[PDB]
């Protein structure tokens, strides 16, 4: 689910970056509420994740070549010899059915080599289970003597946002998913909206990412009025402040000038102490998911703990 | 001293607008703990029906099986519950799905080519190119295929796009729609937005008559501040219409001459339905759930 | 890809309002804002859903391995 940024530099269109979306526009509240978000950890909404927010897939391709000049290994199944329930994953040709679910140990292809006179299989092995997306048979590097020996198999590995996955705004504010907080337990706005992503306020005083702060009230203004805003550097001045510019836009729409929103607690249900800073920020999902050495020996000597060392 | 009969004396309800989908009602002289409880139940407890097990036979479309299955689950079905019993998860699939526990919806679409003069429209260039929610054919099975005779299973919104196809591609599936609650998956939500807003209070400390009254009137939405004349003070006509923007407080001439608060007892509820139940039915069931929750604990043995 | 079913934030069905939105921009020649209002999208969350939709599916469909040329 790729999305076009509301807040963007006009050069985004000049490079036609809409052909390749890199993120999604999310309701982000600068709040310390859950207690699981702090400095390098951020919260993702459960009901948002359940609705396909930030969902991704990962494709992996494998080349099954039979080369290791006389042809010995042949794609398919050998007669008389056939180990139990292999036909569940592979078709008559020995190649797998495109769409089939595979786990580590399952057969990914089948062949027969005359040297051993036995029907063998190339096993699929990875901690992550997959589905077959594409199977391509390639019989090249021959003029008239044609026979298949090379096959390319593409695996589709579904990747839902897991606790640990990194997420970041376009202002260098990356954080790992600390928890997928339920919407009932999530803080709810006066409007009735609960944030998709929760960023902790203690992130901003050290990083000084004020671009994100103005992005929050710009994204909100553009979502309401339905107009994209220019966030190209040096467009604004000391006299012509963006906080005043989008602040006027937020007031005109019917919201708080300083980008705040009166929010209520999901647990107690009571209105929170002060208005929470909420807006629309373009978020990006990052792709990433024993030796006892001399120093550990030294540490075990250190405690005077001779049996732990032993 | 608070009595349950003394609550009946002060408790009031005011219905502003009651549409077929959304109802705007007020709960006067009730506690926050009770008003918040109803809102929480009218978004979690309230269950519904919808696809759950999509059985694919063929899918040559661009849209992956997982994605297409998930989209069918998200499509709300104009099916009244209570007609269905709750499915049991421990017994196997052959005993699990019955005519009382499951509703079957089939989708069988094959795309072909059509001769037309050529930008050209997809409805003109190809046949069965766009797959809609209305293409989910209801198949009644078993003991009861007469109970849904005067009640055919049709999606609440039929024009929902489910898939886009090109000639040669086909979709063949059998979806098993079951009974579930919104806490498990959002695809079971019955109401769109159930929220309350406290009645805004504008405590005018000074008369602030004259041209400052016209300046004070512009700080609030049009139908909030009313002025009698140049004098006769500046009154609050309809404090309910207020957006609570605090615009009046960001002016030196009014920052100390007015106070902005609320009526803690007064709640302005706004309940919109997804389409299955009426907004009143959703609120009534919420009160019935809170009563049943307290009743279940009443007739219960206090162990240890 | 295609128009999402329901608004990510609240859950208001948005999937039936994509083709209708383009008709309000083409034939009716209205502005982006007024078009969304006539569709029944007043919350800014529901507003951005359709307004900000790309619809890459129309670009994706132009590659069809089942029909010649």
């Amino acid at each position: 689910t790729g999305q076009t940024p509301i807040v963007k530099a006009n050069l985004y269109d000049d490079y036609g970056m809409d052909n390749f979306p890199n993120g999604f526009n999310a309701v982000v509240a600068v709040i310390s509420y859950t207690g699981y978000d702090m400095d390098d950890a951020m919260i993702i909404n459960k009901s948002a994740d359940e609705r396909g927010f930030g969902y991704g897939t990962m494709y992996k391709t494998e080349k099954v070549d039979l080369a290791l000049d006389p042809i010995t290994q042949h794609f398919g199944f050998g007669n008389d010899e056939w180990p139990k329930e292999w036909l569940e994953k592979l078709d008559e040709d020995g190649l797998p059915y495109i769409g089939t679910y595979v786990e580590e140990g399952d057969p990914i292809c089948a062949y027969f080599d005359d040297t051993l006179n036995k029907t063998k299989i190339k096993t699929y092995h990875s901690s992550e289970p997959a589905y077959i997306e594409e199977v391509n048979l390639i019989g090249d590097e021959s003029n008239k003597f044609q026979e298949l020996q090379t096959v390319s198999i593409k695996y589709r590995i579904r990747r839902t946002p897991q606790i640990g996955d990194k997420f970041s705004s376009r202002h260098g504010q990356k954080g790992v998913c600390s928890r997928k907080w339920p919407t009932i337990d999530m803080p709810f706005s006066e409007t009735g909206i609960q944030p998709d992503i929760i960023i902790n306020p203690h992130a901003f005083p050290s990083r000084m990412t004020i671009g994100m702060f103005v992005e929050s009230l710009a994204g909100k203004a553009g979502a309401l009025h339905g107009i994209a805003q220019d966030s190209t550097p040096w467009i604004f001045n000391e006299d012509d402040t963006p906080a005043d510019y989008f602040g006027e836009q937020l007031a005109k729409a019917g919201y708080n000038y300083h980008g705040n929103e009166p929010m209520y607690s999901g647990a107690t249900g009571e209105e929170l102490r002060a208005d929470i800073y909420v807006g629309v920020v373009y978020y990006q999902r990052l792709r990433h998911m024993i030796r006892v050495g001399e120093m550990e020996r030294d540490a075990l000597i250190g405690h005077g703990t001779s049996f732990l060392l032993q | 001293e608070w009595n349950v009969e003394k609550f009946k004396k002060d408790f009031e309800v005011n219905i502003s607008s009651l549409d077929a989908r959304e109802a705007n009602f007020d709960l006067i002289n009730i506690d926050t703990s009770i008003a918040n409880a109803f809102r929480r139940i009218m978004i979690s407890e309230v269950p519904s029906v919808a696809a759950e097990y999509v059985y694919f036979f063929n899918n040559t479309s661009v849209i992956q099986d997982e994605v297409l299955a998930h989209r069918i689950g998200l499509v709300p079905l104009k099916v009244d519950p209570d007609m269905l019993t709750w499915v049991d998860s421990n017994l196997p699939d052959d005993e699990k799905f019955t005519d009382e526990n499951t509703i079957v919806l089939s989708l069988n679409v094959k795309c072909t080519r059509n001769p037309d003069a050529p930008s050209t429209d997809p409805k003109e260039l190809y046949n069965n190119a766009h797959v809609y929610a209305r293409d989910l054919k209801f198949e009644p099975q078993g003991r009861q295929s007469t109970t849904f005779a005067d009640c055919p299973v049709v999606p609440a919104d039929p024009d929902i796009l489910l898939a886009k196809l090109r000639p040669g591609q086909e979709i063949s599936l059998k979806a098993h729609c079951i009974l579930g609650i919104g806490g498990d998956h959002a695809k079971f939500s019955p109401v769109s937005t159930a929220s309350y807003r406290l009645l805004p209070q504008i405590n005018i400390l000074q008369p602030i008559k004259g041209e400052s009254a016209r300046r004070f009137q512009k700080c609030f939405p049009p139908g909030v501040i009313g002025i009698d004349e140049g004098s006769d003070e500046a009154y609050v006509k309809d404090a309910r219409k207020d957006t609570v923007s605090r615009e009046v407080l960001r002016y030196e001439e009014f920052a100390d001459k007015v106070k902005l608060g609320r009526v803690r007892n007064h709640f302005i509820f706004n309940v919109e339905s997804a389409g299955a139940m009426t907004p009143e039915e959703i609120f009534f069931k919420s009160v019935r759930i809170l009563k049943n929750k307290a009743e279940y604990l009443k007739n219960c043995p206090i162990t240890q | 890809m295609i128009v999402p079913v329901r608004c990510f934030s609240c859950g208001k069905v948005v999937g039936d309002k994509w083709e209708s939105y383009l008709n309000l921009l083409q034939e009716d020649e209205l502005d982006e804002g007024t078009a969304l209002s006539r569709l029944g999208l007043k919350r800014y969350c529901c507003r951005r859903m359709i307004l900000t939709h790309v619809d890459l599916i129309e670009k994706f469909l132009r590659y069809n391995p089942l029909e010649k040329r």
């Binding site: 005109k252 | 139908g223 706004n270 | 007043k42």
Partner: peptide, 24 residues
């Protein structure tokens, strides 16, 4: 340096629960 130019047409578009855009 020339200052940016303001926009045009910016009316209200948020009211109470049971109140529409009837008030102009």
């Amino acid at each position: 340096r020339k200052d940016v130019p303001k926009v045009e047409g910016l009316k209200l578009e948020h009211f109470a629960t049971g109140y529409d855009a009837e008030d102009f």
